[PDB]
Amino acid sequence: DKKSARIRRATRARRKLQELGATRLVVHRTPRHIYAQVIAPNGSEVLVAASTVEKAIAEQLKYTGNKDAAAAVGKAVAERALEKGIKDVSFDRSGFQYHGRVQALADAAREAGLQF
Amino acid sequence: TSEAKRLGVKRFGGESVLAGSIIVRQRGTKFHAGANVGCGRDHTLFAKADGKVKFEVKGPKNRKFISIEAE
Amino acid sequence: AKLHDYYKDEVVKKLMTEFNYNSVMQVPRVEKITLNMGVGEAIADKKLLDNAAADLAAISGQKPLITKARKSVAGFKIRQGYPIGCKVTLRGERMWEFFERLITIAVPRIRDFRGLSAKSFDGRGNYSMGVREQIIFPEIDYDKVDRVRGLDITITTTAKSDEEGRALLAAFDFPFR
RNA sequence: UGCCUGGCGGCCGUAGCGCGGUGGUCCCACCUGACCCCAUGCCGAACUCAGAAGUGAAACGCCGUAGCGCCGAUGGUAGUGUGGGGUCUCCCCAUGCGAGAGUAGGGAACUGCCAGGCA
RNA sequence: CCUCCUAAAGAGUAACGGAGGAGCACGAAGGUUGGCUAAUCCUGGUCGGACAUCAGGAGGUUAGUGCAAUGGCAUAAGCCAGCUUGACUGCGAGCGUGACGGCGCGAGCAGGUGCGAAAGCAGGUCAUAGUGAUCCGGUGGUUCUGAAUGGAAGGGCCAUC
RNA sequence: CCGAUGCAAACUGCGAAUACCGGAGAAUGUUAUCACGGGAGACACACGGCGGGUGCUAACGUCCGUC
């Protein structure tokens, strides 16, 4: 049991962030591809979603999944959020570890000038 | 070879309770806090903002949540 | 690594020819070999357990972890949390070398070598065995022997039936019963 | 706009359990070694690094199986507020509210958004 | 002083009513991050057969959570590794009860902390019992006041054995 | 003890009427409601109906909640 354990572990913060009702940035990390979504407090709509699979940002990337790809996804999400007006969404690690690609993506997102 | 304690729901559904009001002071957790509802150390559900009180069943385990909606 | 190449080259090929599967890895694979002791005689003395644990660490590539008791029963005079045994978990190159070194030299030299016990299965595919005279292994020498202790080696099998376990055991020709 | 796959919510057994079949186009999964970021209350056990080198083993998506389980009427039944009566320990009368279980029936769920492959 | 009924589905409602336990304890059994989370049963083990230990499975909260007993508890209110003392000070809208003395929960503000990348958490312990009011005696501060003046004796309030 | 059948104050995978809290509404009721102030009185109640406990499920025996 890997996916079930991951979902169960993430559910802690997933429910914790709901009490305060703030927009949340979640990241789904896979070796083949990486995705980053901004979810409104309602939980049924995503303000902005970025994926490594699409060729908009994968043209300059040798492979869809790597540290450089994570940084590119983070910067794309950050710039899109800046031009959309997210107003300092909170962050969630989706039950992952904040030491590798997750940390790289978070640092890339914060580089643009975000305050999360 | 004592003195009874007061339990049960103090504020039911539809009451426009005030912030900090004790909706239910129960033994443990008969109902779980939802939106705009806290949980004290003694497992007491207290309102966080003015509004109407509602009870709703949600979750795979079918557990009742006490929630507060706009007045 | 060292033995997995030969495994895939020969054992997988022979078993595939025998059973006529479709998926290349349809042959069940072994994940880990758990080294354990059923000594059950360290209750009086803790130094015996300490020495046996040192022996396990010496023979294996990693040190064991002391395990506590599960239940307390007055009939057998056992409390809760009592440390009696320990286990070693191996998965990967260490396991490949351990298995090769064992099956090469250690297995043949057994007193009363009447064969293995295929009937001693879990009923689902795993085979667990225990023999005395750890002195047989070369990592332990005669000059550093405290007492005779039994072993417990359980091979990991992902199969859903005993036929696959029998085939895997016969892969190394299963000398005899 | 149709089929397929993942993620995020509502619904919490009409979403479940058992059985047969199908999925490598994309996606997802199995994994090599880790002396490198990271680590084991021992184990690269779990997370992290490079994919198609092979595959769909197991999990998971879908179709059928109503076998199990679930919901579920109308009706009746027990019960009960009110006023009265009797052989007054108990029951009945007029009126209002109405069980559980089972039967008919359903279902192998549905719905909102984003992403990707084939059309 | 607490743990269920008689007590007729809100609370309450009887007769040395039916029932025991606390009158402790943890200064760690407190707070924070990551990860993990069965019991029970079939089967293999030198004995181990289930019963002195381990791994392949059925099963998902029947184990546990310090207590006699009780509810709720797998996003476990548990259970491994980590860092500390928020068990800090002034407080505090509102609420639950009470005849009073009062008791409990509590959003949130100011100072400064620990855990964290952040989101945020921490004003003791999973909780219901686990304690002491009035008076009296011991100590520190205050010229606040002081029977003419400056002190002092003696009082008044703050912490508190 | 394995499965089944009946049964219960410290038994409920379900579940009434009744009672309680709150919201909306026509009609009636001399505001019958709430708050403060002055003045009180009373502080061995009895019997009966309704549903129980207790009692030897013998008593015009005993105590409860409602009228």
Swiss-Prot record, chain A:
Q: What Pfam families does UniProt report for this protein, alphabetically?
A: Ribosomal_L18p (PF00861)
Report one GO cellular component. cytosolic large ribosomal subunit
Q: Which GO terms describe its biological process?
A: cytoplasmic translation
The answer, when asked if Metal-binding is one of the entry's keywords, is no
Query: Per the record's keyword annotation, is Magnesium included, yes or no?
Result: no
Annotated region (Required for binding of the 5S rRNA/L5/L18 complex to the 23S rRNA), positions in chain: 1-16
PTM comment, free text: The protein has been shown to contain a phosphoserine, which was required for the protein to bind to 5S rRNA. However, the presence of this phosphoserine is controversial, and it has not been seen by mass spectrometry.
Q: Which UniProt keywords apply?
A: Phosphoprotein, Ribonucleoprotein, Ribosomal protein, RNA-binding, rRNA-binding
The protein's GO terms of the molecular function aspect are: 5S rRNA binding; structural constituent of ribosome
Q: How does it assemble?
A: Part of the 50S ribosomal subunit; part of the 5S rRNA/L5/L18/L25 subcomplex. Contacts the 5S and 23S rRNAs.
The similarity comment for this entry is: Belongs to the universal ribosomal protein uL18 family.
Please quote what the entry notes about the protein's domains: The basic N-terminus is not necessary for binding to 5S rRNA. It is however required for cooperative binding of L5 and L18 to 5S rRNA as well as for binding of the 5S rRNA/L5/L18 complex to the 23S rRNA.
The record describes the protein's role as: This is one of the proteins that mediates the attachment of the 5S rRNA subcomplex onto the large ribosomal subunit where it forms part of the central protuberance. Binds stably to 5S rRNA; increases binding abilities of L5 in a cooperative fashion; both proteins together confer 23S rRNA binding. The 5S rRNA and some of its associated proteins might help stabilize positioning of ribosome-bound tRNAs.
Designated name of the protein: Large ribosomal subunit protein uL18
Organism, by scientific name, is Escherichia coli (strain K12)
Q: What is the lineage of its organism?
A: Bacteria, Pseudomonadati, Pseudomonadota, Gammaproteobacteria, Enterobacterales
Swiss-Prot record, chain B:
The record's comment on protein family reads: Belongs to the bacterial ribosomal protein bL27 family.
Q: What is this protein called?
A: Large ribosomal subunit protein bL27
Q: Which domain of life is it from?
A: Bacteria
The UniProt entry, under SUPFAM superfamilies, shows: Ribosomal L27 protein-like
Does the keyword section mention Protein transport? Answer: no
Instruction: Summarize the subunit comment.
Output: Part of the 50S ribosomal subunit. Cross-links to the 23S rRNA. Cross-links to the A and P site tRNAs.
MF annotations from Gene Ontology: ribosome binding; rRNA binding; structural constituent of ribosome; tRNA binding
Q: Which GO terms describe its cellular component?
A: cytoplasm; cytosolic large ribosomal subunit
Organism equals Escherichia coli (strain K12)
Q: Which InterPro entries match?
A: Ribosomal_bL27, Ribosomal_bL27_CS
Alphabetical GO biological process terms: assembly of large subunit precursor of preribosome; cytoplasmic translation; cytosolic ribosome assembly; positive regulation of ribosome biogenesis; regulation of cell growth; ribosomal large subunit assembly
Is this entry keyworded Ribonucleoprotein? Answer: yes
Q: Which UniProt keywords apply?
A: Ribonucleoprotein, Ribosomal protein, RNA-binding, rRNA-binding, tRNA-binding
Curated annotation (Swiss-Prot), chain C:
- Give me the Gene Ontology terms describing cellular component: cytoplasm; cytosol; cytosolic large ribosomal subunit
Pfam families hit by this protein:
Ribosomal_L5, Ribosomal_L5_C
Lineage: superkingdom:
Bacteria
Q: Which residues carry this modification: N6-acetyllysine?
A: K2
Sorted UniProt keywords: Acetylation, Ribonucleoprotein, Ribosomal protein, RNA-binding, rRNA-binding, tRNA-binding
Report further notes: Identified as a multicopy suppressor of the slow growth phenotype of an rsgA (yjeQ) deletion mutant.
What assembly does the database describe for this protein? Part of the 50S ribosomal subunit; part of the 5S rRNA/L5/L18/L25 subcomplex. Contacts the 5S rRNA; cross-links to the P site tRNA. Forms a bridge to the 30S subunit in the 70S ribosome, contacting protein S13 and S19.
Q: What is this protein called?
A: Large ribosomal subunit protein uL5
Which species is the source of this protein? Escherichia coli (strain K12)
Show the taxonomic lineage.
Bacteria, Pseudomonadati, Pseudomonadota, Gammaproteobacteria, Enterobacterales
